[PDB]
Structure 1
Amino acid sequence: CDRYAQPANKAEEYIQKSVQMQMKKRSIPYGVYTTSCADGTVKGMAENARVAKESANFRARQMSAGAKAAARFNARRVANDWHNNGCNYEEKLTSRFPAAASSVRPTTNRY
């Protein structure tokens, strides 16, 4: 999933960041912001949604050493087999960068 597989270097997190930008571009297809990344209604939950992920971003690199090692083999188990079939370039992008291929989120849930 997102925010659970930790990147190793600056190079992995940057293309992890860049594939998230197209998932912004999917859910924000044009100049209107969608109704579905609204993540809040009141002033209290506006900044609560920001500090919720930053504790969960820490709990990726906090929890273990082998389950997060199993994540980087698991990240090819969603992308290689049912997201980028036929593209070898997009296949070795997973096996060279699993944490970048883990927030690619092609389950179009408009988020």
Structure 2
Amino acid sequence: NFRARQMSAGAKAAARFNARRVANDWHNNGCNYEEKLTSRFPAAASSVRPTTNRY
């Protein structure tokens, strides 16, 4: 958890654009509310983990 905020400044800046690249396009299609929840909160839309691996 520390090594998220430790490692860089641009790859973690690329994370918040990458977090919409899994949620908007193949997790919440059709729901605009769940689409701007990603673009207003990418780190909240990044542990949504809809790959049901039972974890």
Aligned-residue RMSD, C-alpha = 0.0
Larger radius of gyration: 1
The 3-state SS of whatever aligns with 2:16 is helix
Identical-pair percentage:
100
Structure with the larger helix share: 1
1:68: which partner in 2? 12
User: Where do 4+ consecutive residues of structure 1 move more than 4 Å?
Assistant: none
TM-score (norm 1): 0.50
Name which structure has the greater RCO, CA cutoff 8 Å, separation 6+. 1
Structure 1 residue ranges without an equivalent (≥5): 1-56
For these two proteins, the number of residue pairs brought into alignment is 55
2:21: which partner in 1? 77
Q: Which of 35, 43, 46 is the matching residue for 1:99?
A: 43
Structure 2 residue ranges without an equivalent (≥5): none
Alignment of 1:36-51 (within 5 A): none
The 3-state SS of whatever aligns with 1:95 is helix
Deviations 1:57-78 (A, max 9, x none): 0000000000000000000000
TM-score (norm 2): 1.00
